[PDB]
Design a binder for this molecule. Structure first.
Ligand code: HBQ
Ligand code: MG
Lengths: 403, 519
């Protein structure tokens, strides 16, 4: 009755997603959590007439020893009707603390006719029992409609702090609230508390400590700078340059190329000629800045690829049209998978902060390994889209800072 | 009674209206005695000729209703099972009783609003005698939602008994109720009687202790004892002429035994299927197929049991390389008491090395373990940490193996070669493009036949490797060949690649570089 009538996009039916198998530790955490959500009317056991399913997972958190239930609503989120802004001021604040306000949802009931689409299953070890089935009664954490539906109620609540602390940029995204302020880190955390407690007024633990958007400088392309240049060096250099010429057409190779005149031994040292020292120096300048004319339009998808740079280092880029990167960065400091998941999250927290959307990730990892271990390290409350790929050889070369 | 699960027809669709085919008067009688009693039990009820719906019915006497139309119109239900347990995950019990649940679907109400779509018709003998129309009051055999609704009811009807008796394991499977415990013989038989009474007080009837199946329980291709498990009896056929069909069925059964019989091999056997033209075609057995067959029937002559999972103890998984692209493994808890075993041969990709392939076997085993035991085992592997890290750090894809211990049990896995990371000073340099030109003036233009733009870029390099000495620097314009060699395989589907690999293993130092077009 009180609920807001929600519907799926026209023609669409509910999600029937397969639940990845879980470890008994996670199942144990999921049973304890869900048993309590049931005693409190948040979720209800469902019968066999509900054919839908969304996967569930358990994760660990920050500043806690408790488990957090994570519902993979990606599929449902895509079949849910659109609802009919984004402060670029946010990426300019000295600091931003991320809050988990997902709990505010457990008060608003959910349209009785939509509930069945929130069905999920807690699996059993070795299939020895059917699996415990449930659906949501209230707005669930992780569903695209929850922030949308609790928006009115969320503004009213923020209205005060808003006018009272005009020096703060409060941005909401899914179950997260982003709090930005140029105040000194000292006083920053104090003002966060005056927000947490003002939320209790109507809770919210920290995600991450702060992020510092202000220094999210792009990682440009660099050429090696050496004393003596062998033939091999010149060949790597031209190759790198030629590919970079796809982006920056001002890049000229002609002169460096007149150096690999014929078939010389790879290790032969080649002093560079005037015409050439000047060509390298000039290509060098063109790369000092990211290419002009690259603008983000909300109309298209944000794609993100990550490359393994070996020795605990990774590189990544964000773009919408190939070669037109909106951002390109690095990440270092564990095991391969642990790092990949942190980078993935760090890069996601960035697109959200910068453009308000999570990007589509192209990951260099076998799917089964990712599906097996990502939850052991995941801390976010959201889950971006991802596909799996193989990183060609040369793409890595062309992307890192070796001395 | 038990609560009712509401059912609906698919969106838009209307109930069934397919007319009853002619019924032999001998069959009409039969169906009237059958349907009249079903109305005496509660299963069905006569309905007034205003119910447009109707579903066919013939007689086999047992009444068999044809619901393939109503089913097409009935809503989708939550999957009935999708996944049975594996013996290796089961626990050891002192006693295990299997309780056949009779007239299961018959003892569960069917959503009232739905019943009118279950309407069927018994044709009158006389061109105008009865012509009675019935509808179901319970779950109909053959109807789309009966398996699902039944199981879901059984679960609820079992819940309390399960809370009262937490020392009793109960597994529901279609029509069987496998009940197990560690109670002493006598107490177990009493719980089995109580339970029997618990189901009864809900109408669910079962078989007496005299009539209930006694283990070994033959289930889903296995042989179950309260304390152990194996695969049902299976030794190999004796024959003079083997047909493709026989071979495939043979290969099929040998694989099945791999989950518990370590050592089974199928390679020589599989190889017989090459170029086969008909299922009925005979294929004589190679000296090698006979040896492999002879060894399989010997392994399969002495039965092996698998113990059950003891949750108090760790899981250990040990892997061995049993040939190129072949891996065997076994998971045990009690040193060498096999919970399970298996073999792994999947070659993800056209090329690979024993390291990548051992790592993929570790992921398959990890996934399997998470399904069966809900956790990952401590791994014992024939590879040293240093060989592992060394390929890890240098590979582009991201990967991660759980806690494992090196176990010096050959063959140890390793890398046969490694490409330098810097050009070699003093090594001749080949620029390949189907031939090459060296910096010392050598050249070998060769024109190949029946090639592929890609297989040609690989031949260039191969030639360069052959004519060069122990140390060599090679320059190619192929990103493709570059990718393959750089991945550093030691095994491939391609013979060419395999040739390059033998070459690379022999070299002392090889450096590969790439440069674009324009040599
Ligand atoms: C009921 C107890 C349960 C179990 O833990 N161990 C055994 C051991 C021997 C058996 F014959 C059955 C089973 N069990 C089981 O669920 O078997 C289904 C897969 C058929
Ligand atoms: Mg060339």
């Amino acid at each position: 009755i009180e609920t807001v009538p929600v519907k799926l996009k026209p023609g669409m039916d509910g999600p029937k997603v397969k639940q990845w198998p879980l470890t008994e530790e996670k199942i144990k955490a999921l049973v304890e959590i869900c048993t309590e959500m049931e005693k409190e009317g948040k979720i209800s056991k469902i019968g066999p007439e509900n054919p839908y399913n969304t996967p569930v997972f358990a994760i660990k958190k920050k500043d806690s020893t408790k488990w957090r239930k994570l519902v993979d609503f990606r599929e449902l989120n895509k079949r849910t009707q659109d609802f009919w802004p984004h402060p670029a001021g946010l990426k300019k604040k000295k600091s931003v603390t991320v809050l988990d306000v997902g709990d505010a949802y457990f008060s608003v009931p959910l349209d009785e006719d939509f509930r069945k689409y929130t069905a999920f299953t807690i699996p059993s070890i070795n299939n020895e029992t059917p699996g415990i089935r449930y659906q949501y009664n209230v707005l669930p954490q992780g569903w695209k409609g929850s922030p949308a539906i609790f928006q009115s109620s969320m503004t009213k609540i923020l209205e005060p702090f808003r006018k009272q602390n005009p020096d703060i940029v409060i941005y909401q995204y899914m179950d997260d609230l982003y709090v930005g302020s140029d105040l000194e880190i000292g006083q920053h955390r104090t003002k966060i508390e005056e927000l947490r407690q003002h939320l209790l007024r109507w809770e919210p633990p920290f995600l991450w400590y702060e992020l510092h958007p202000d220094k999210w400088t792009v990682q440009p392309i660099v050429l090696p700078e050496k004393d003596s240049w062998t033939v091999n060096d010149i060949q790597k250099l031209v190759g790198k340059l030629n590919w970079a010429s796809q982006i920056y057409p001002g890049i000229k190779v002609r002169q460096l190329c007149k150096l690999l005149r014929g078939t010389k031994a790879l290790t032969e040292v080649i002093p560079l000629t005037e015409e050439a020292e000047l060509e390298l120096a000039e290509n060098r300048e063109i790369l000092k800045e990211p290419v002009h004319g690259v603008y983000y339009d909300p109309s298209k998808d944000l794609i993100a690829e990550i490359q393994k740079q070996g020795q605990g280092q990774w590189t990544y880029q964000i773009y919408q049209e190939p070669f037109k990167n909106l951002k390109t960065g690095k990440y270092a400091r564990t095991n391969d998978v642990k790092q990949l998941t942190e980078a993935v999250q760090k890069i996601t927290t960035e697109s959200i902060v910068i453009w308000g959307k999570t990007p589509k990730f192209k990951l260099p990892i076998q799917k089964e390994t990712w599906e097996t271990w990502w939850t052991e390290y995941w801390q976010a409350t959201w889950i971006p889209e991802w596909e799996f790929v193989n990183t060609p050889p040369l793409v890595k070369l062309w992307y890192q800072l070796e001395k | 009674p038990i609560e009712t699960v509401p059912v609906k027809l698919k969106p838009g669709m209307d109930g069934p209206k397919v007319k009853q085919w002619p019924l032999t008067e001998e069959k009409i009688k039969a169906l009237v005695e059958i349907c009249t009693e079903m109305e005496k039990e509660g299963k069905i009820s006569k309905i007034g000729p205003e119910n447009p719906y109707n579903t066919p019915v013939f007689a086999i006497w047992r009444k068999l209703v044809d619901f393939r139309e109503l089913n097409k119109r009935t809503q989708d239900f939550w999957e009935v099972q999708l996944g049975i347990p594996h013996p290796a995950g089961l626990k050891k019990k002192k006693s295990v009783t299997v309780l056949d649940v009779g007239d299961a679907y018959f003892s569960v109400p069917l959503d009232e609003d739905f019943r009118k779509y279950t309407a069927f018709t018994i044709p009158s003998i006389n061109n105008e005698t009865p012509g009675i129309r019935y509808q179901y009051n319970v779950l109909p055999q053959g109807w789309k939602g009966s398996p699902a609704i039944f199981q879901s009811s059984m679960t609820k009807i079992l819940e309390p008994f399960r809370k009262q008796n937490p020392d009793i394991v109960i597994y529901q499977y279609m029509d069987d109720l496998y009940v197990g415990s560690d109670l002493e013989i006598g107490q177990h038989r009493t719980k089995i009687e109580e339970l029997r009474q618990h189901l009864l007080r809900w109408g669910l009837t079962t078989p007496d202790k005299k009539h209930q199946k006694e283990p070994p329980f033959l289930w889903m291709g296995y042989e179950l004892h309260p304390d152990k498990w194996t695969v049902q009896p299976i030794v190999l056929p004796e024959k003079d002429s083997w047909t493709v069909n026989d071979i495939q069925k043979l290969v099929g059964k040998l694989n099945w035994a791999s989950q518990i019989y370590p050592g089974i091999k199928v390679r020589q056997l599989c190889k017989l299927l090459r170029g086969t033209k008909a299922l009925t075609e005979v294929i004589p057995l190679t000296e090698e197929a006979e040896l492999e067959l002879a060894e399989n029937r010997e392994i399969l002559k002495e039965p092996v049991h698998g113990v059950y999972y003891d949750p108090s103890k760790d899981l250990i998984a040990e892997i061995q390389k049993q040939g190129q692209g072949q891996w065997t493994y076994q998971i045990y808890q009690e040193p060498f008491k096999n919970l399970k075993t298996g073999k792994y041969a999947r070659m993800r990709g056209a090329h690979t090395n024993d390291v990548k392939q051992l790592t993929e076997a570790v992921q398959k085993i990890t996934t399997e373990s998470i399904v069966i035991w809900g956790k990952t085992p401590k791994f014992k592997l024939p590879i040293q940490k240093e060989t592992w890290e060394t390929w890890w750090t240098e590979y582009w894809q991201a990967t991660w193996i759980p806690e494992w211990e090196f176990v010096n049990t050959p063959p140890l896995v390793k890398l046969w070669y490694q490409l330098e990371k810097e050009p070699i000073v003093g090594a001749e340099t080949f620029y390949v493009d189907a031939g090459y030109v060296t910096n010392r003036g050598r050249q070998k233009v060769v024109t190949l036949t029946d090639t592929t733009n890609q297989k040609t870029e690989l031949q260039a390099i191969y030639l360069a490797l052959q004519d060069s000495g122990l140390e060599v620097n090679i320059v190619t314009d192929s990103q493709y060949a570059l990718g393959i060699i750089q991945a550093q395989p030691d095994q491939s589907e391609s013979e060419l690649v395999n040739q390059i690999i033998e070459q690379l293993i022999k070299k002392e130092k090889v450096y590969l570089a790439w440069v674009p077009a324009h040599n």
